[PDB]
Request: fold
Amino acid sequence: PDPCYDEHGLPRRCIPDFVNSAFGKEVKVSSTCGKPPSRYCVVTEKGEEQVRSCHLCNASDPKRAHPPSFLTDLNNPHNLTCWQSDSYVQYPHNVTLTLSLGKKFEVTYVSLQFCSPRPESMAIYKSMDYGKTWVPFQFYSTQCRKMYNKPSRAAITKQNEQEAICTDSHTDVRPLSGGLIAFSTLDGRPTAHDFDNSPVLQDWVTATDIKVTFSRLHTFGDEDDSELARDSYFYAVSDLQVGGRCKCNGHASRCVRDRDDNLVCDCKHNTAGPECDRCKPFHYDRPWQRATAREANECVACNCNLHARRCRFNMELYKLSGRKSGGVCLNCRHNTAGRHCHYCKEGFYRDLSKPISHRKACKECDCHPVGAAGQTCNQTTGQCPCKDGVTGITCNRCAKGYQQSRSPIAPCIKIP
Ligand SMILES: *[C@@H]1O[C@H](CO)[C@@H](O)[C@H](O)[C@H]1NC(C)=O
Ligand SMILES: *[C@@H]1O[C@H](CO)[C@@H](O)[C@H](O)[C@H]1NC(C)=O
Ligand SMILES: *[C@@H]1O[C@H](CO)[C@@H](O)[C@H](O)[C@H]1NC(C)=O
Ligand SMILES: [Ca+2]
Ligand SMILES: [Cl-]
Ligand SMILES: [Cl-]
Ligand SMILES: [Mg+2]
Reply:
């Protein structure tokens, strides 16, 4: 039935399936050819020598068009579909593709398959917010310092596992077609074998949005002086994939769509939030944790003895509890008061025929106006303070050895 839970009832860690989060998703592209229609030449090889061809890009024409929708469409090797950029975009100048996922993902690989020859310099970035800000995932260039101001193949140390390497790898042509770029978020990082227990990595792989930027271009022609180049140079890619899973903090087996049309974890274990990053309301007894293989870490309910609908977590009480219970109740109802709403407030006492949860569990003090030396009774017992000859819970009768008078000042008087 439910993978988020045991054979019997018990919370166990759960993860959504690894998928290609890009598939069929519309990517935004800085440029697309065919408006206005345009000719493009491509120089290529029969292995010993250079052969050059020519073609047209027409947005209008399906057979001769190349939309951004071809980046994520179903990839068939034998029948290829390529997005193609404009021409005469080249350093400085970049073509940029961004993919909004609408929700936070754990990204394993970002991978590209190029129709043109691969870029001399390109960069992958991610966004953790919703497309406001961008931090570098990885750089690719022949000259790293000159292009991106990054050292060449910088070692990754435990000290910083979140820096982006810039490599000269995957900058080569050949291939002038079908070159792959595969970026791995966890590759060469010292705590990756430990990922589940490695928060900084768990942060690293977390993205809402993914951006690819192509900067410098190979010139495969390749006259000096005044050369109005006979050859156009562009960027063309048949496939863009980002592999990974919806980020649920181990608290969900799946993500789903809202009544508000938003992708969110279908959150289990008494958790809430788009990432399951925090506890569901009234569930504040212990603090929030990421589910692990060893520990499910379900948010547990506050105990209000059915007298309060909201509570808050107190870390200090949690600690002094032996890290057992930290919740305290808010705005107890039904004339109760205290951490757990476990006692009646002043002016009331605890009727002990009724269970602590009972809505009537706290009776109003009924303290007899004449036989009692004061109005507020004992919260736990119900006993009113009793003037000298008087007894009863309510201070309503005379003791043995005492006789009743008609006086409101002195109701019970000792015999001889
Ligand atoms: C592009 O192809 C379309 C086919 O619908 C054709 O009508 C047009 O003449 C071609 N060139 C353009 C759009 O100028
Ligand atoms: C290539 O794919 C398109 C997609 O509709 C199809 O119309 C076309 O016939 C395919 N070409 C071949 C040779 O299979
Ligand atoms: C193009 O890329 C440069 C460096 O790649 C980047 O700083 C810039 O934001 C991009 N284009 C713009 C915004 O002019
Ligand atoms: Ca394609
Ligand atoms: Cl093409
Ligand atoms: Cl390579
Ligand atoms: Mg092409």
The longest strand covers residues 95-114.
